[PDB]
Amino acid sequence: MLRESGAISGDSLISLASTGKRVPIKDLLGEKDFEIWAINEQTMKLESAKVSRVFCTGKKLVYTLKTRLGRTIKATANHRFLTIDGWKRLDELSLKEHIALPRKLESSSLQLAPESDIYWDPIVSITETGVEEVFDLTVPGLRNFVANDIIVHASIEQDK
């Protein structure tokens, strides 16, 4: 059994752990060996992880996902997000379902100061937007990264 890998809009802003800035994934095309923020599901802590490659799978239909806090991203229907019950494709998600947001951001204060590295935010809407070039990252090990301040699954590498 092979799962099908997802992709996100080129406008998605990727958080660079070392640089501390956010760059659209389209600008990282062809780049490698740079650091991103990813969640370790076991420890549930945010770690710095290296990207092995950035690639484009062409023009595909993307959907806009919005959360209660206003986090937004455009992704293919098969792209996976982190829920309480594990990774779920965009077309598997239900309204009011919680997805993982990083608490650590490129700011002085954490996400929810008033009250361990993840904030669970409900989905308010998923809407079909249109067709545009979509990209993904390969993150050996953790296999996820922060895009538009949302935890998103990285490329699904299929050795076999």
SS (H, E, C) 113-137: CCCCCEEEEEEEEEEEEEEEEEEEE
Q: Supply the CATH number for residue 148's domain.
A: 2.170.16.10
The single-letter DSSP state of residue 149 is T
Cα separation values, 70 from 44, 53, 141, Å = 23, 29, 29
Nearest to 141 by CA among 155, 127, 123: 155
**Triad 48, 36, 153: Cα angle to 5°:** 105
The single-letter DSSP state of residue 103 is S
Q: To one decimal place, what's the resolution in Å?
A: 2.0
Sign, CA torsion 47/36/98/41: negative
The single-letter DSSP state of residue 89 is E
Overall domain count for the chain:
1
Structure determined via: X-ray
Range of the domain at 19: 1-160
Cα separation values, 73 from 76, 79, 95, 149, Å = 10, 11, 15, 9
Q: And the tokens for 41?
A: 């599901």
Nearest to 132 by CA among 7, 4, 3: 7
Concatenated DSSP letters of 35-86: EEEEEETTTTEEEEEEE-EEEEEEEEEEEEEEETT--EEEE-TT-EEEETTE
